[PDB]
Write a protein that binds this ligand. Sequence first.
Ligand code: FAD
Ligand code: FAD
Ligand code: FAD
Ligand code: FAD
Lengths: 380, 377, 380, 377
Amino acid sequence: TARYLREEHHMFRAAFRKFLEKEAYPHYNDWEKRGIIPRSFWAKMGENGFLCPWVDEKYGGLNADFAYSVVINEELEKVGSSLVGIGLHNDIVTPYIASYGTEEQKQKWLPKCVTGELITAIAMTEPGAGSDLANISTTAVKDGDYYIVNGQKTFITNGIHADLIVVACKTDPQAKPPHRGISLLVVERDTPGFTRGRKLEKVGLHAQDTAELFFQDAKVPAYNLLGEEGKGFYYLMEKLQQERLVVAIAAQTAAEVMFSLTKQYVKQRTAFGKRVSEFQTVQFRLAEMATEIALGRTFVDRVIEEHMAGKQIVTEVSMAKWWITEMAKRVAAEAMQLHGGYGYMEEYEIARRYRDIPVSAIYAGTNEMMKTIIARQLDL
Amino acid sequence: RYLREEHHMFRAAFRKFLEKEAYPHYNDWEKRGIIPRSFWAKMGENGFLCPWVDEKYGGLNADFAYSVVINEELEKVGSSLVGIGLHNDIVTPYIASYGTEEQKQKWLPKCVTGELITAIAMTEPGAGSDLANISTTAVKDGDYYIVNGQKTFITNGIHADLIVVACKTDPQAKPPHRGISLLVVERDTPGFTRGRKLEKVGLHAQDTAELFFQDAKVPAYNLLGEEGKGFYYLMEKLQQERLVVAIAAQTAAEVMFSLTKQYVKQRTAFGKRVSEFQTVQFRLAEMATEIALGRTFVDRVIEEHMAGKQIVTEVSMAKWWITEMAKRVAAEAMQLHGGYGYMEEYEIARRYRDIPVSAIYAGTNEMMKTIIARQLD
Amino acid sequence: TARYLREEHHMFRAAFRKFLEKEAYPHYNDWEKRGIIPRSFWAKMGENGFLCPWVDEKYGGLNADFAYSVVINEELEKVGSSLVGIGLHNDIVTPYIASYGTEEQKQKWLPKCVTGELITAIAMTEPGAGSDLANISTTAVKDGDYYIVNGQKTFITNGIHADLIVVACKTDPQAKPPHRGISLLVVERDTPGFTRGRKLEKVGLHAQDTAELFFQDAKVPAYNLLGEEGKGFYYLMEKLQQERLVVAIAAQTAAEVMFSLTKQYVKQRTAFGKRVSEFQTVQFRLAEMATEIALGRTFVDRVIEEHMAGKQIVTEVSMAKWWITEMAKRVAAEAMQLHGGYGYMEEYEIARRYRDIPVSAIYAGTNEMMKTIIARQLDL
Amino acid sequence: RYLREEHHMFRAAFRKFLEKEAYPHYNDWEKRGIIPRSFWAKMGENGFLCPWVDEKYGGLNADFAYSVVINEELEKVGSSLVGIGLHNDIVTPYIASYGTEEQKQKWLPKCVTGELITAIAMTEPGAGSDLANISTTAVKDGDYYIVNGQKTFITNGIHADLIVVACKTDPQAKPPHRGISLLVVERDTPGFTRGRKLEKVGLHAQDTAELFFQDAKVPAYNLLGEEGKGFYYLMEKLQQERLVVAIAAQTAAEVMFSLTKQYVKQRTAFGKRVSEFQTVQFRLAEMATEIALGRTFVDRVIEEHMAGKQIVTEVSMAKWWITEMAKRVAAEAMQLHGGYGYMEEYEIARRYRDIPVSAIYAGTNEMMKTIIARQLD
Ligand SMILES: Cc1cc2nc3c(=O)[nH]c(=O)nc-3n(C[C@H](O)[C@H](O)[C@H](O)COP(=O)(O)OP(=O)(O)OC[C@H]3O[C@@H](n4cnc5c(N)ncnc54)[C@H](O)[C@@H]3O)c2cc1C
Ligand SMILES: Cc1cc2nc3c(=O)[nH]c(=O)nc-3n(C[C@H](O)[C@H](O)[C@H](O)COP(=O)(O)OP(=O)(O)OC[C@H]3O[C@@H](n4cnc5c(N)ncnc54)[C@H](O)[C@@H]3O)c2cc1C
Ligand SMILES: Cc1cc2nc3c(=O)[nH]c(=O)nc-3n(C[C@H](O)[C@H](O)[C@H](O)COP(=O)(O)OP(=O)(O)OC[C@H]3O[C@@H](n4cnc5c(N)ncnc54)[C@H](O)[C@@H]3O)c2cc1C
Ligand SMILES: Cc1cc2nc3c(=O)[nH]c(=O)nc-3n(C[C@H](O)[C@H](O)[C@H](O)COP(=O)(O)OP(=O)(O)OC[C@H]3O[C@@H](n4cnc5c(N)ncnc54)[C@H](O)[C@@H]3O)c2cc1C
């Protein structure tokens, strides 16, 4: 057992699962077909208190601790990875508004983030730069009471639905070092000069509305600056600890789900007068998967505890992110293979789980970037 | 060492054909879920179908190296073209090896032209790896066989006009495998129906389907070889089947390596080509090494096979190891493209989805290891 | 941080390390040359309270909790794996006497186990059976007030020094199932018919006195029966949880030691105008080793906590044992390679660490047996 | 395909020789820390040293396949015999390729007989992988070179009567590698001393030592080739060096596989042979597969090498991949023997200790990947 969950979280998990059993599980395949999860689902999430529950009661939130977010994100992954946009809204983007927003900004935005009237996104990555974030070239040039924004952002989660987009841009492209010229600017829906691409066709996460964003002389009120000019990089580096933790949590859950699928399948499939689960190689493969899952679960649970205690754990979250995502990828490969021909059929859930997992090694920072961060912390 | 100048010239000419007839259309075929029969017709009229078939049926008496070239060049277009290799090098050889003079005359000419596309149906919902435990029955009611059963995952399952079906003509054979025969089932057989095109992770243009036999009336002269010797024919032909899969997986690995190398050489980050970071260099060096090992091994197996030698162990080794290697290449390739590796606009995404099934068909990699272990005594 | 260590354990670790810095570290290489650790070392351990510290004060012990044993075994491994005989005495064998001994037996044996006047060993494995323990063939036939013992035991840790040997033997060879015929019998030094082989030449653990034991009509007092006849297998299965945990702890420490050796080496070695630690492949290899070490440490620490709480964790300890031992083997292989030619030289400590590690995957139950146990617990 | 009947007959005869002169004595040699010169003498008198050397110096003009047979058969005895392969196929070829007519006449006859045992000294305490950064100097003081420096890890370091030493005859060469020459240093050179036999994890009968030069007086006619072209000679010869290592590692893998297979087939547990448990079967199938891949690859490299083709990439691939594979085989072998794998009475223990150094010498596996990456462009 992990110490961050108490009885209240256990009853919450059951209540949230009951909601999903009606609203998510039976609808998920249709959402994938359409390429997007309907706004009405977010509205239902908001009215039931499952959006931004950590937000203060004065904005309509529940003052919930981070364990509630762990439960939400785990239960949503149990449905499917296309639901990652909720965890992104809850635990990645809206915390920027709460941490760095003025009272006026928080009052204006947070209540609607809780209800789901405003859906959020964060836009860092550009065609020319992802891992090398200091090299982004989207510019925001001050002109009167406005920032004139020019640039392109790519692979944006919630790219179609998002009404509020936290945009990383260069307010001073000539700054030394380059990262000191970066600022965070909130871009609202229907901003003149702000357009969106058609939803991106991807290997998986088919129900996630990933899209490119285009800023052609985007006229953004100066009021929409989040925090201080030229400190944008610092806000990002700070919040990426929670971001990477969220990815680690979702990948751990995905592995657990895929293991359960495989175990159940091989226990019911017969070959050569035996259940497939009776062959020693199958037993050992499952034992090895179970072991690695136990390791990842124990580690991520410890990192959650450290995080909740307010401790700085850059190294450990980077470890959790790369290792658990690779582990879940290995689980997926084993799972497909152990299903035989059926693991390659879209009628079987494992096919979708398999297509969904490998991107976890790429986003929130590639696993190569995680190893880079670890090596830096090792002092070499 | 099995490729002579004639094969190099043929490769260039076949590639030119595909640059016109296949490469520009592949993405459309995938969207359609099938490769049009018109393409098969163009392949047939140009002599690219069953080239090994004797000239007397309209073939070219081509050696196996021509089939290697064709299958490799088709994979470089994409894995959904595996149906042609299956027609050419898996199924039609059953007709030539075990067909009567009369069956060969009736069927082989049209297989060369592509008027008849072939398929082979072994696997059932209840049994794949455990092939001896198939339950599809063919009961004589002269001069017909009455066939009952279901076959699953059939390549060319929609297009196929001739299907070689493994069935139990004596379900009480003891030992069970002794009751297996091969029966050719023709398009428009009464009681023979097909399922919808299967929705798969990849091979989107390959028409895989289930087949259904409900008191299907099959003429007794459609028996292939002798009653009760079907299992023996299958074990015999599975060596070339496994070789074909190994060749295609080897080619897929090479294609994916090339895509990845080109990408990382053009992509820059932190003031360098991605290909300049030492970890990327070593990963590419390791991929290049395993690719070279697979190429050398499969080439030697091809040579042995063409020499008429029994290669059961070696082909089983090639099949499992090369398919697993190709899978590892795919995983490296997606990762090294970053977000772009996950985008369907990039070819690597499709290559990635296509590869993992190679570890499953022609017999699972677990079955390959089972065979190797048996041969190790 | 792991919750089982308090300030008292931290001061204890420092005190114990101070003892070892004088008595163990500088002598270790000589012990390996001789093939045995001198009795005088055990005597020093006993007089300083470092043997069987968990034993009750009434037998001369300290009533120490298991965290003291964790510290002792970790610190001894930091010296070298040839010191495993101490952890075996402390935490594997003597607990059998405390758990299953009569008051008379405990009074007779435990005080001298604390002082080191009696060194203990456990003898299960035979030439014909190790993994398949139910198939042991050493017999003990009752004759008057004695058991007549015939058989051979192999690979016995503390095989030369041991004065008390807990011997698994068949008191009823015809029993059904075979395991119901197994009993534990304490064999004392100078028992008529009991002899020992020459110390076994091994790949590593060169200072550990591993030997075969021979029983040719060994005349053992019936008083020396430990527990109940035919329940021997049950005692063994019960105590193997702690045994496997001890092995996992030592392997985790060995990995940590080997990592430190490698990191320090590559940081000081120059090639191509750079420190070796500056090449990206070296950085990533170290980052990967660091990650896996962090996983093993977090997991074993959690298992220690569960164990100390009195919980039954057969699955988790089997996971810890196989995965950590394999991980430490991988660490060792990386460490040798990263030292270049120097990693193959016996003058460098890594050579010895490398030779010492791979046996951890074999003893206390092979890693194949660990996977067997896990699969059984998965219900397949 | 490089072995003809003559080579098969030779293999049998050489093995017979070793069954008498080597196998029964190997464990004793290991205890002694050296292979006696008497064995070298028996090898020489039977024509098993430098067989490729022209008949005019007393050699046999044997092709490289004879060296393959010798090195393989010696490894089947044990890895401490690598000094012979080093003499035959690594060092003496420097004398034949770059020696003047007069040096060849002076040295090659005695290398064939074994009167002179050879060694090559590249590596220094401060530089191994980074060979261009060697600091051993050879300064002309006609008609001598005055040599100062230290060489480390020298195979045949005790026995060697001739040592080919890489040194800087112009330490200000810019570019540095242009100042490297090869200088033959003879036994009993003034100022030339040797360290104690190095204590190693394995290769216990191989006499590895450090060499010390303190104003060593070396005759100028002991220069091998031209001044400042030493680096070029080394890069040229390292292809055969790396091939020799790959061959020995391949053979070690095969030996260890055979030991393991035999053990698990004779050992029983839980009412079955250990070899009957499915996980053991699959592990052995995987080992057999990788061994087959390595054998096929190294055999093809040997063929290419004998054809006189440049094989830099391929040999680097063979060296790193096969040594890593052999290491994996060793780890599997110890585990599958249980406790017995850890006992020095069992041959597998020694094989296990011997193998990992193959990933280090002839250039580290990291250097092999560096070379491959460079060739990938
Ligand atoms: C489904 C999905 C959703 C996404 N959502 C968002 C979002 O909501 N907001 C957002 O800002 N971004 C988002 N992204 C972008 C994602 O974070 C980036 O794809 C990721 O950071 C990698 O950047 P890149 O794609 O440009 O790859 P690159 O940075 O171009 O790297 C390509 C490859 O080179 C490797 N590489 C680069 N440098 C080195 C080096 N120094 N050493 C070794 N290897 C190196 C990388 O690890 C990678 O494997 C999303 C991506 C995906 C796939
Ligand atoms: C794209 C595609 C095309 C196909 N085309 C054809 C075709 O044209 N003709 C045809 O006849 N078939 C075809 N198939 C079927 C294919 O050959 C089978 O899927 C394959 O043989 C495995 O059979 P199965 O799917 O029933 O898996 P199963 O036999 O049920 O096995 C499932 C899993 O169980 C494991 N397993 C089973 N037995 C053992 C054992 N004893 N020990 C350890 N593990 C074991 C295997 O690891 C496997 O991963 C096709 C399949 C695919 C995916
Ligand atoms: C340094 C050292 C110290 C030791 N100290 C002691 C001691 O103090 N007391 C004591 O009692 N013993 C001791 N041992 C013995 C040790 O526990 C045994 O070696 C171990 O349990 C394995 O038994 P075995 O050597 O007989 O191998 P075996 O049981 O013969 O097994 C050989 C191989 O076959 C594999 N195998 C067996 N069955 C299966 C199966 N069903 N499926 C898959 N694989 C299988 C095993 O995993 C192993 O890899 C020691 C051993 C060593 C090396
Ligand atoms: C048994 C034995 C026999 C030998 N016999 C001979 C002989 O006869 N003649 C002779 O000349 N030499 C001999 N050697 C030397 C051997 O070739 C060297 O040990 C080897 O080349 C590596 O050099 P090094 O030991 O100095 O390691 P280093 O060059 O110091 O390298 C140590 C580690 O650093 C890493 N490294 C270095 N540079 C890089 C880089 N750029 N990128 C990533 N990693 C890097 C490598 O991974 C290596 O593992 C022998 C060695 C042994 C062990």
